[PDB]
Design a protein around this ligand. Structure first.
Ligand SMILES: [Zn+2]
Lengths: 59, 145, 38, 207, 176
RNA sequence: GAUAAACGCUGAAAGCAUCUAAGUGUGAAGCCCACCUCAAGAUGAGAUUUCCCAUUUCUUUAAGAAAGUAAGACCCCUGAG
RNA sequence: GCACCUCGAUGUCGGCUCGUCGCAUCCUGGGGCUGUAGUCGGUCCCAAGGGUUGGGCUGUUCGCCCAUUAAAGCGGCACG
RNA sequence: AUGUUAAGUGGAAAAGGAUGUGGGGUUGCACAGACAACUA
């Protein structure tokens, strides 16, 4: 799961560690299992989430 | 035993790429090429399946070596006959037979089993600016790493 | 040539140099004084 | 440069002008024919394909007749390639005869050595025997196979096996005489091979 | 640099073309070119030049001194040219000149033959003197050290070929 | 052909001197070729010349099965270089 | 020196046959210094491609001797 | 973010040797002219 998430996030301008920090600073609690499942099936949902993380650590 | 995707044999498309090797140190270019051949940049990565792309390396003659590697880094070989080490080569490979150079760097950064040996047959290396593979319509990759 | 791990100027006209990573003494008055550290 | 194919007839003797006795080897070479010309644009290098010794026609097949048809000859028994010869100067159909060489003409000579079969280390490699008396049980054997530490035998440990039958060339021999109406060359010394076996003669590499 | 700061002022005939790196002094004999570096630059107001240095380099002065020395040499030679004179002691030795063929007779069981390239010549007046003449400072020096290399001078009688000012030390070989 | 010890040429840092930092050479029975032999199972399996060119039912039409053949090869017999 | 290892078994030295590797180089190749005139030498540096002998006496290595040679190297490999 | 190393040091070893480079100090001699180089 972690390697698939890294692969997907680097396509949205992030890396794995910065995106995990961003999701924690926003209070999102998705598994790494559902995150990878989204990364392969629903790219638009994965981008919604990556934008929320990018705005969280923009402070 | 539940739902995580696993890819199949001929299901994930493989694209062709062109990478340019003028003034990139040997190992940095070689690390990036090695990750692209294994498919690590695609969320469909599964370890018992092959999902990497093909790579063309152009301008291997102008690859960079820092320090005194061009004279002091040596490649050895044994013929398995008594007293038969061959320490013949140095950065002479970069002058003559610069495909050997790039290939032996990329080969040591791939797994050592039957999948990693089949992923090595997607590297095509050229000492000059021109390749013979224009019918596969390859796209340019740009390195900064 | 003398090759010794102690290389020392031994008259007036001896000079010390570094032609690689290698200390040497060079004298124009006496060729016995020429030395290279090793 | 110069080079011809022939067959081995045998050895004899001859006296010279001054009156010295000299051992010799007769080689017979009827005219050789150029069958093909290899160039860099087509093949990647430069050479010449030559044939020797006409063959009856129940003994060849259709691909061979097609290969020999562009040169207007009978099918041949022996076909070799001759390299490092300024092409020009040559074309399919030409005949190379023994007057390519003249007396003098230091030359190289190649063949295939006689066959001898399964032979031991003493005849095959020049190894020496053990003692024949004095309580000995070690006459005609190949020696110790190595030391203990590597737990194995090294390569090029030499043993018994099949002897002879390899190709061998001998350098810097002289042409003593050339006879044109008989297609014969006389070479000073001995050559490798049996009688009726293929022999190749080229001008020498060390000049 | 004291050398790096000094002045090079070009006598008559000098033209100095600029193209990126290359400089090409020309004069009444030759038209030498040499490749110089970026971090030291050209100059204006003909019949004078100085070189300059952006500081803060580690050694702070070396490249400067060499980049001026070389240009001063090119000018000094393209207007004037250089000279090297070789003597001959060692009874029985002689040189002779035939175009670019320098023939030498030094104790050997064969004469020795040297041939001078484009920019260089020879000048043998007598069986003892030789003169190497050119524009380059490097090539004239290399060729003279080549010639004197055929037979250096011994110390017990000082025979052999020497530069025309070499100070040779003389030993006392005993009489047996 | 490129080098070891050694020896330079031009040259500054360090107005001089200095084989070295930038540039430029010489130099060993040693190193890579040069000579001889093996080698495309080099699964990266390479190249050139010549020779040979279509019946039957269908699972379904598919790199389908089965049958008789071309060029060529082999079994079997007389042997030896 | 020690006693980890092997006591339901790990057979000692010289010679023979067959070698291979290190270099702290015995010869041959290239060099600097000499209290190096030449002919021979001393010593230090680079160099492992190839070469490195037959007898007498002792079970003998070791050793001494005889006649030669460009030279008659020193170690590891279960003191092969 | 700010520096150091050019030795593949990092990624085995000492007495001793050295105009390798970074930082901090103590001073002799300097425009009533220094060190070096060239005349006499
Ligand atoms: Zn002195």
């Amino acid at each position: 799961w972690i390697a698939r998430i890294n692969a997907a996030a680097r396509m949205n301008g992030l890396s794995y560690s910065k995106l995990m920090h961003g999701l924690k600073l926003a209070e999102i609690d998705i598994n790494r299992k559902m995150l990878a499942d989204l990364a392969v099936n629903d790219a638009a949902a994965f981008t919604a989430l990556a934008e929320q993380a990018k705005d969280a650590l923009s402070k | 035993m539940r739902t995580t995707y696993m890819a199949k044999a001929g299901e994930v498309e493989r694209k062709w790429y062109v990478v340019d090797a003028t003034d990139v140190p040997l190992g940095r270019l070689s690390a990036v090429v090695a990750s692209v051949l294994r498919g690590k940049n695609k969320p469909t990565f599964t370890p018992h399946v092959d999902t990497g792309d093909f790579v063309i390396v152009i301008n291997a003659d102008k690859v960079k070596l820092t320090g005194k590697k061009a004279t002091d880094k040596i490649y050895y070989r044994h013929s398995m006959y008594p007293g038969g080490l061959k320490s013949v080569t140095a950065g002479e490979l970069r002058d003559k037979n610069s495909r050997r150079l790039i290939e032996t760097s990329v080969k040591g950064m791939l797994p050592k089993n039957t999948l990693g040996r089949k992923q090595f047959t997607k590297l095509n290396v050229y000492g000059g600016a021109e390749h013979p593979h224009a019918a596969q319509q390859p796209e340019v990759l740009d390195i900064t790493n | 040539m003398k090759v010794r791990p102690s290389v020392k100027p031994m008259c007036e006209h001896c000079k010390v140099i570094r032609r690689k990573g290698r200390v040497m003494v060079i004298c124009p008055a006496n060729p016995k004084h020429k030395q290279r550290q090793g | 440069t110069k080079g011809i194919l022939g067959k081995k007839v045998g050895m004899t003797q001859i006296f010279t002008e001054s009156g010295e006795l000299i051992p010799v080897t007769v080689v017979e070479a009827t005219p050789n024919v150029v069958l093909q010309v290899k160039t860099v644009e087509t093949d990647g290098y430069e050479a010449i394909q030559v044939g020797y010794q006409d063959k009856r026609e129940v003994l060849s097949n259709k691909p061979a007749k097609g290969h020999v048809a562009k040169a207007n000859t009978a099918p041949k028994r022996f076909i070799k390639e001759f390299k490092n010869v300024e092409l020009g100067e040559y074309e399919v159909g030409k005949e190379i005869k023994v007057d390519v060489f003249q007396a003098g003409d230091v030359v190289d000579v190649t063949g295939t050595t006689k066959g001898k079969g399964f032979q031991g280390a003493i005849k095959r490699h020049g190894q020496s025997r053990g003692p024949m008396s004095h309580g000995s049980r070690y006459h005609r054997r190949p020696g110790s196979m190595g030391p203990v530490a590597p737990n194995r035998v090294f390569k090029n440990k030499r043993l018994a096996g099949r002897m002879g039958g390899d190709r061998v060339t001998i350098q810097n021999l002289e042409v003593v005489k050339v006879d044109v109406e008989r297609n014969v060359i006389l070479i000073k010394g001995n050559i490798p091979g049996a009688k009726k076996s293929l022999i190749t003669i080229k001008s020498a590499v060390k000049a | 640099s004291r050398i790096g700061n000094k002045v090079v002022v070009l006598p008559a005939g000098v033209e100095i073309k600029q193209d990126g790196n290359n400089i090409t002094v020309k004069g009444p004999k030759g038209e030498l070119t040499r490749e110089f570096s970026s971090d030291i630059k050209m100059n204006i107001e003909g019949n004078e030049v100085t070189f300059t240095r952006p500081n803060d380099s580690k050694e702070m002065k070396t490249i400067h001194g060499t980049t001026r020395a070389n240009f001063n040499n090119m000018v000094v030679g393209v207007s004037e040219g250089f000279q090297k004179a070789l003597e001959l002691i060692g009874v029985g030795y002689r040189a002779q000149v035939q175009g670019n063929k320098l023939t030498l007779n030094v104790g050997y069981s064969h004469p020795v033959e040297m041939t001078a390239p484009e920019g260089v010549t020879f000048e043998v007046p007598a069986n003892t003197q030789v003169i190497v003449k050119g524009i380059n400072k490097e090539v004239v020096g290399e060729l003279a050290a080549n010639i004197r290399g055929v037979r250096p001078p011994e110390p017990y009688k000082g025979k052999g070929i020497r530069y025309v000012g070499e100070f040779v030390r003389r030993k006392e070989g005993k009489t047996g």
